[PDB]
Amino acid sequence: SMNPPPPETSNPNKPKRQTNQLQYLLRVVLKTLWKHQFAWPFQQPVDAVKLNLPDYYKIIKTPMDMGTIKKRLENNYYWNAQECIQDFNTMFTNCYIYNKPGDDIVLMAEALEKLFLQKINELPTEE
Ligand SMILES: COc1ccc(Br)cc1-c1nc(N)nc2[nH]cnc12
């Protein structure tokens, strides 16, 4: 054991708002990545116990996953698009930090990240 508590997805102390960019992040970016054949290892927090990765949370100190992101978006947790984009970037970076180039999980992260970059390139101007 043990896993840390997951990242928070609600906090009434955190300022938040809905923006057209955050709506795009949910409706376009997250939906595209979520349906990909390679999304599955990124859809929930790493369970280091079940996966027998005892070093995971010694190495990765700012964990993030698309389950968390989806709930943050659905819960209007974010103040702006940059906060959400930073969560996706943390998710990808963590995978590259923990694993090694050529590992299947890294190939999968790379395929998701490429789609992410393609979709974030068309992030709308703030309304
Ligand atoms: C939720 O994570 C997984 C679920 C099932 C399985 Br099999 C592997 C992972 C996983 N494993 C590793 N080594 N690094 C990761 N980075 C993001 N996912 C992972």
Residues 6 or more apart from 122 whose CB is under 8 A from it?
28
Our mutation pick for probing the ligand 1 site, out of 46, 53, 56, counting the most ligand atoms within 8 A of Cβ, is 46
CA angle 42, 48, 52 (to 5 degrees): 115
Residues with CB under 6 A from ligand 1: 41-42, 44, 46, 51, 53, 95, 98-99, 105
The token pair that represents 116 in the structure block: 């992410």
Residues 6 or more apart from 96 whose CB is under 8 A from it?
106, 109
Closest CA to 80 of 13, 17, 122: 17
Resolution of the structure, angstroms: 1.8
**Deposited experimental method:** X-ray
Query: Which sign, positive or negative, has the C-alpha torsion 39, 93, 123, 104?
Result: negative
* Alpha helices in 1-127, H assignment, sequence order: 20-24, 31-34, 56-59, 66-74, 81-98, 104-120
Long-range contacts made by residues 70-77, C-beta under 8 angstroms, separation at least 24? 70/26, 70/30, 70/34, 71/9, 72/9, 73/22, 73/25, 73/26, 73/30, 74/26, 75/9, 75/10, 76/16, 76/17, 76/18, 76/22, 77/8, 77/9, 77/10, 77/11, 77/14, 77/16
Q: Do 64 and 91 form a contact (C-beta atoms < 8 A)?
A: yes
Report which protein residue has its CA nearest ligand 1's atom 10. Answer: 41
- Encoded amino acid at 46, one letter: V
Q: What domains are there in the chain, each with its CATH number?
A: 19-123 (1.20.920.10)
Q: Kindly give the number of the ligand 1 atom that is closest to the alpha carbon of 103.
A: 13
φ/ψ of residue 24, rounded to 5 = -60, -45
